[PDB]
Each structure stands twice: as structure tokens, then as C-alpha cells.
């Protein structure tokens, strides 16, 4: 299947005193592998998966240097944005940045992205062609012009098409035991009686990786969405994911209903029936 490397950065200004809270996380697919937290004692990029620990002191110095440079960029940005939007020095505000690359099943570059937000709203994003910008408002337009003059897109494209994919490939090989393994969902159905006339069937998908999954209900072989509930896919905390889908059915008619599970780890989709 396809793979991705993504970094997420959050900076939150602290107006009363000091520098912004800064948190950076790196993922390969749905596996976090590094972190930086300005509140933590080390002031280093830290490992969060075993397969990254083999990288040497020069890697950790380099990543620490770059992630600190990100934090300082965001510090400046927070001041600039406050000015652009005519905001006081009293309120806390948020900068968010996410970038990364996707590769296909052949491990070749598929797409790149670099998105930036101020206070939880779109500010500026690199377009799909990696050669132009989407600026949401006139403040971000000013930024767009600045970044065009500085040829930011070309240098980001070189990272996203080259460096990002090269290191993604490296991580996928070094972490092969977990990163290239699929864990198929462990499935079962539960039954819950509301009344004499109504029952809830819940179809469970547990302990799966990667997080992408589809759960659907059918009645007499036809998709049913009415009287169904589908929860957000959620982390188990051991690196796997969980999801369930439920349907309300007339008591005694449980056998009409089937749950269908689609996942990368399943060569053919599963069907469950009460």
C-alpha cells in the first residue's frame, strides 16, 4: 500500500511571559517516531519508536537544530500575525504547520504538501503542483508575495519530492518489522436489547494497523445507513486502532443484518452476522 511521512507543529503564544509552547511530532503512516516539546527537559528531538534509535548523534543534533529553528520561525510569525490581524498583546494565539510526502505502493513520490494555519483557520498552503500557493485572506496574500519573491516553493518542492521520500524509504526499511506489517482487524459482534421490540447490533474492529478501515452494515444484502452509528477511529495505545459500527434492528430480525469489514490486512473483506 501507500506510505507517508508527516510532521505536525503547534506553537501557542504565552502573552504574560516567555516563549510560545512548541510541540512537534513526526509520523511514518500512523506511527509516531519523534517528538519535541519545549516544556520537556531534554530540549532535543526525542525518539518515540525503536527503529529510529539506531540513528546516530549527528541525526539527533541535526533534527534538534532544525526543529528549534521551526520554533523560532513560529515565535516570529506569532508577532507578525498579531500585527497583520490588529490583535492585542493580551490574547494567546496558535500557529499550526503540517508538511510531508506520500509515496505509492512502489515507494515512489505520489504527492507533497505544506499547510499553515493561524488560530485554527487556513492561512497559506502549497498547491498540489508544489509551484504555487493558496492564500486564504489578504494577510496570507502578503505572505504569498514574500514567499514567491524568496522562491520558497522551489526549495520546499525539492524537499517534498526528494529528501522527504528518500528518508521515508529509509525509515520504512529500518522499521520493516512494524512499519511494513499489516495487522488485520480482530472482529466480533455484540447484541444489546433496548426493549422487547428493539435491539442494537455492534460490529467491532480491534487491534488493527494501519488506521484506515471501512465498516458498513447491510440489510438483506443492501447497504443501510439509517439507524446506524459509526464512531471515530481511535488509538488503542499500543500502536493499533479500534472502531465500531452499530445498527438498531427489530428484535428477532438480527439475521437480516450483516457487517462488512474492509482493511489492507484483509485479502477479502470480512462478513459478520448475528
Amino acid at each position: 500500500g501507500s506510505h507517508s511521512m508527516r510532521y505536525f507543529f503547534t506553537s501557542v503564544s504565552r502573552p504574560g511571559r516567555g516563549e510560545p509552547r512548541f510541540i512537534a511530532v513526526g509520523y511514518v503512516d500512523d506511527t509516531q517516531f519523534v517528538r519535541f516539546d519545549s516544556d520537556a527537559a531534554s530540549q532535543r528531538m526525542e525518539p518515540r519508536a525503536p527503529w529510529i534509535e539506531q540513528e546516530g548523534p549527528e541525526y539527533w543534533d541535526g533534527e534538534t537544530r532544525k526543529v528549534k529553528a521551526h520554533s523560532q520561525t513560529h515565535r516570529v510569525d506569532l508577532g507578525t500575525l498579531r500585527g497583520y490581524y490588529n490583535q492585542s498583546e493580551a490574547g494567546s494565539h496558535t500557529v499550526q504547520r503540517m508538511y510531508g510526502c506520500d509515496v505509492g505502493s512502489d515507494w515512489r513520490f505520489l504527492r507533497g504538501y505544506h499547510q499553515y494555519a493561524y488560530d485554527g483557520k487556513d492561512y497559506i498552503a502549497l498547491k498540489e503542483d508544489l509551484r504555487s500557493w493558496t492564500a486564504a485572506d489578504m494577510a496570507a496574500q502578503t505572505t504569498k508575495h514574500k514567499w514567491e519573491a524568496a522562491h520558497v516553493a522551489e526549495q520546499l518542492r525539492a524537499y517534498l519530492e526528494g529528501t522527504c521520500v528518500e528518508w521515508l524509504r529509509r525509515y520504512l526499511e529500518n522499521g520493516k518489522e512494524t512499519l511494513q506489517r499489516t495487522d488485520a482487524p480482530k472482529t466480533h459482534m455484540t447484541h444489546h436489547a433496548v426493549s422487547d421490540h428493539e435491539a442494537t447490533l455492534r460490529c467491532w474492529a480491534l487491534s488493527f494497523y494501519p488506521a484506515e478501515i471501512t465498516l458498513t452494515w447491510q440489510r438483506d444484502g443492501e447497504d443501510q445507513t439509517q439507524d446506524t452509528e459509526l464512531v471515530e477511529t481511535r488509538p488503542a495505545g499500543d500502536g493499533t486502532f479500534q472502531k465500531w459500527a452499530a445498527v438498531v434492528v427489530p428484535s428477532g430480525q438480527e439475521q437480516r443484518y450483516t457487517c462488512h469489514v474492509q482493511h489492507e490486512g484483509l485479502p477479502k473483506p470480512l462478513t459478520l452476522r448475528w
Partner: peptide, 11 residues
Amino acid sequence: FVLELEPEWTV
């Protein structure tokens, strides 16, 4: 592997 964010690339 984090981006080499150049100093000029502030908003």
C-alpha cells in the same frame, strides 16, 4: 527527517 527551514521563510 525535518525540513531545512530557511530563516527568511517567516510569514
